[PDB]
Amino acid sequence: LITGGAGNIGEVITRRFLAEGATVVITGRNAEKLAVYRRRLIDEERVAPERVVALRMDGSDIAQVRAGVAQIVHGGTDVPIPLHRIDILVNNAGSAGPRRRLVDIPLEPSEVQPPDSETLAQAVGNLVGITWNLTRAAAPHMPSGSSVINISTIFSRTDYYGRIAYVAPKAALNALSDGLARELGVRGIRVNTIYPGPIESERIYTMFQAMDALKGQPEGDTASGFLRMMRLSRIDQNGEVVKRFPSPVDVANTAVLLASDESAAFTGHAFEVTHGMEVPTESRTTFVSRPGLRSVDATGKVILICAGDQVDDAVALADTLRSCRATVVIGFRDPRALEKASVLLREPRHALAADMYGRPTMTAEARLVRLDPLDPRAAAQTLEQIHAELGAIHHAVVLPGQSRHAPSASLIEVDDQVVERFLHQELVGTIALARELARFWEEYPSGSSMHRVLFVSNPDDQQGNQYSHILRAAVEQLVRVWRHESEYDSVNPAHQQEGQSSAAVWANQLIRYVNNEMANLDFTCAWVAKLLGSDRRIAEINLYLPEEIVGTIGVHNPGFGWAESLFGLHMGKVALITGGSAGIGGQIGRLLALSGAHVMLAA
Amino acid sequence: GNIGEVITRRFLAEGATVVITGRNAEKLAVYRRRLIDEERVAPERVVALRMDGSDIAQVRAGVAQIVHGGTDVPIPLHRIDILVNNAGSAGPRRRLVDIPLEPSEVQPPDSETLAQAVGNLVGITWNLTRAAAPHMPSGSSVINISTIFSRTDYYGRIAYVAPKAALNALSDGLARELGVRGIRVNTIYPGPIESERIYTMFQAMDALKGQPEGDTASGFLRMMRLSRIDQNGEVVKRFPSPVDVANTAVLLASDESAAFTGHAFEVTHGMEVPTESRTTFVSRPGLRSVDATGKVILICAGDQVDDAVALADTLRSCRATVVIGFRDPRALEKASVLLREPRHALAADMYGRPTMTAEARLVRLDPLDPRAAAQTLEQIHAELGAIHHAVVLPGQSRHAPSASLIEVDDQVVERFLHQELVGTIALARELARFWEEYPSGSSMHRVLFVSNPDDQQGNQYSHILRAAVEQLVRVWRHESEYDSVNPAHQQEGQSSAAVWANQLIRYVNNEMANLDFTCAWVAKLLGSDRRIAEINLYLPEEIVGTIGVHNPGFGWAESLFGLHMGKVALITGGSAGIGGQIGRLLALSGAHVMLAA
């Protein structure tokens, strides 16, 4: 019925489902010691024992009980009800996690504080891993026309200061439901993705007072910002333009219908119970044009290309960045990839020169360092060592760790090894790398220009690109929060850099798993170079690229700044060329035709 | 139809009241009643009224008052009522070039003229919305059923998509406005019935398209999920069901789901389709590759003298002749006086060099009035030849003096819905016929649909026109491309060409360069070979904010970009004269300069 049956919204919903049935399988807490007597007396009120199953099932984060049914398929606590199939299942997590900035998130258990609950890996698990493993558990079971219900925060699209550990895994259940609807609907199972809104009470009020005290703004700033966002006015206790926040009664009212037969039509339905809100649920901008790269001037800057295992595109991306006449430091996650990349880069065509326009440049040779977000202290020491070697680090392209995740696209019948590799190494790994970058930005001296961190995604796998999909969707909210919450910190008296001056961060994420051409690699790197080396600020988080090689506009840019400078010079002027079939004449005719004139080649 | 029957059947009980209203042909209640009362329940709750077909504001208000007062039996008291907007007609099934503008063109399939087709279930819905302004009890609800094809490319039903669209924009504006009182409008998408009529209709469409049988239905059976239980396993794509969507919609209308306001009711069983095909301008286009030497651009202008003349200047800067047609009278002479001045009477290209391009002609066009616009189209044909580039601007600058939608009582919105939506549809066919009646082998046909600018209080009407345009462009582009290969229509004269249209929304940017950015985007999608795969285009909320570029015809400085990059230069006496200009162009090139004087 409801995963969060222990002191959770679902534990409250247990008061329902009894008028037309009975509330059963109320999952208990992890401790399971005081949970046996917890809410047992409350549940016994106005409800006979009957077959109501209030067993304190262990909501384990890891899959040690995944094979175990515990009222799923067979066995059970005391009755054979696991043999029966329950028509509903809820993927609620109910773990807020730590509430801190991007400099001091508790990555390891030694870094935890009493205000903190769990660690970074635990925090990511408590919101993604339980969802995924409970989805896999008892997959062939449940009725042929059952229902699957999710619950996520409505802040998964709105900015949320100091809650990256909350939203970064909370921006992943929606993506996973999106990717799983297509591959699950076959058997005839729907995924009702319903988001109950914040409940109006004194707790959220005090939360917001603490919130705007932390950000450093006058009282009621966040309250005004989230009240003006409201477009509808409630009719509770009549009145006019009350504009009260959403109530849990409406949450129960919109949740109970999933058990009824009327829900059979819905599938993949965004069902945000927040009433009358306008947010751009998805932020994107398909590239209409092809960027001009001969106005970047990235010289005098260091670009740490944090590549995990996909160094194949990295070496080329590093060379393209070198073409901007910029020094680069290529960082590697896997150990053996370092040797292969060194061998590949030693050969010319990768370490040749900083070839830009129609001319070369020495610039600096591409360095080679080993990094790993799994170990915090080693990665921080390596970053400090790079600081001592060169100085500050501002431009940092961030690529995922492993290339082409998993051998198969299926996400139902899979062993947990690859899935647990995807978590704790791509989500947690990238969050850890962002943590180290933010530590370097804050606790170490930097400049005044804004800080750029691109988040290029995995390429096309000729299949369902869900493994790049989760990466993109979990990166979107992360970069959005990192962008918005790092502006108040640059002016507040709390964080004045110990009297020094610093800058905020602006971070997009390119998406290239939608094109399937051969020039898409040059296209993405071009966009990467333009977003790093130039001055520009796009207000959209995610950036999408066209569905064709050239897409809307047909341009190829093989270092042809001259042909770009010669555009439209002699427009609409017929030209006659004698002997223009070999030598200087052919070249003059070709450059004139590229200019725009009309040419008549005679030989 | 069937969904209305099921809704009325569910009304028979559960503490509900049934009202079979909205009679057709001004008298249909007698033809459609007394069958709901045939059930044991509701001995008197069954109510039928012979309301006017057009349902103007005053007659709608009278009908509402007589319903509140009942059939003289109950005390007069306004209360809740049925506000579902399911009442409507399909309209003509005419093809992409032929259209019933005048009533004389009535056909057995086309029982309604263009204006009547537009008002079938759009104008009447808006008028009923206005007539339900004064007294709607708190906690009520109202929906506007739209078709699921309001985003999917269609064929032969431009009159069932262009007016069937913009209901979303009207609902958006009404949700923003009327939400203060505590009322809601949510778009609802009941799917096609799994009946034999819809099955044979698909077969007819396949035959009409000139394609092998089954591919049109394959487009629905391929990119649509199943996620159903019917027939136990192996539930093949059978399209959504009407009874389920009707029952769920009326359950939303009842309690247990109050104040949802998070429902689009897009019941297509998956069917991944964007809610709006659009992109953002994160870069400024480079107008250097634009070429229109041998091309004629006719600007379908209106009373907007300033904007149309600016567009004419920015297109004539691409060495092209123009024909500026103005919709309303008494504006031709002002345009002539303004254009007489040398500011707009001289054409200079993007480098700042004057060009001896043909001057700006001036004609008079009357979209809403057929047989005269076509005559003028043929006249300008005889004058110049075929015309392919048609920038279509709206009728009036500000569609209403007050930025509101429900306070009015059908006085100016009639002019809007009759001369700026229908007007556009009439002009679109006027142009389509010129292109198809006279086939011309060339590139695809380009029809931009620039929207009006923003001054204050946003642009609710612009939103409406945008929603109607996106679909008109989408459905058209599809039909055109499909009909470019059919030998049936190919034999008419010579070989023709397809059409590719777009939109260039501007009502979101409020700056000083939004009337120059718009000129750049109109001149880039016409004078170049760039096929946007997305329908609606949108300006950035901040021009200098995302990409600040200033282009007063300065293509030289654009050509001199990144030449001497990362070099330090020392200049002597570089404060005024030749050396100052060398320093200026070198700094624009990318080098580092050190001015000393």
Author numbering:
A (entry chain B): 13 to 615
B (entry chain A): 19 to 615
What does the paper say about this structure?
Full-length RfxMCR was a homodimer of two cross-interlocked subunits, each containing four tandemly arranged short-chain dehydrogenase/reductase (SDR) domains.
For the first time, we here determined the cryo-electron microscopy (EM) structure of the full-length MCR from Roseiflexus castenholzii (RfxMCR), which shares 58% sequence identity with CfxMCR, at 3.35 Å resolution. The ED (Gly783–Arg932), which comprised eight α-helices, was inserted into the SDR3 domains (Gly573–Glu782 and Met933–Gly962) and was exposed at the two sides of the homodimer. From the full-length RfxMCR structure, we first resolved the conformation of RfxMCR-N and RfxMCR-C connecting region, which was folded into an α-helix (G573WAESL578). In the center of the homodimer, two of these α-helices were anti-parallel arranged in the reverse direction. Instead, it plays an important role in connecting the RfxMCR-N and RfxMCR-C fragments and also serves as a point of intersection for the two subunits to form a dimer.
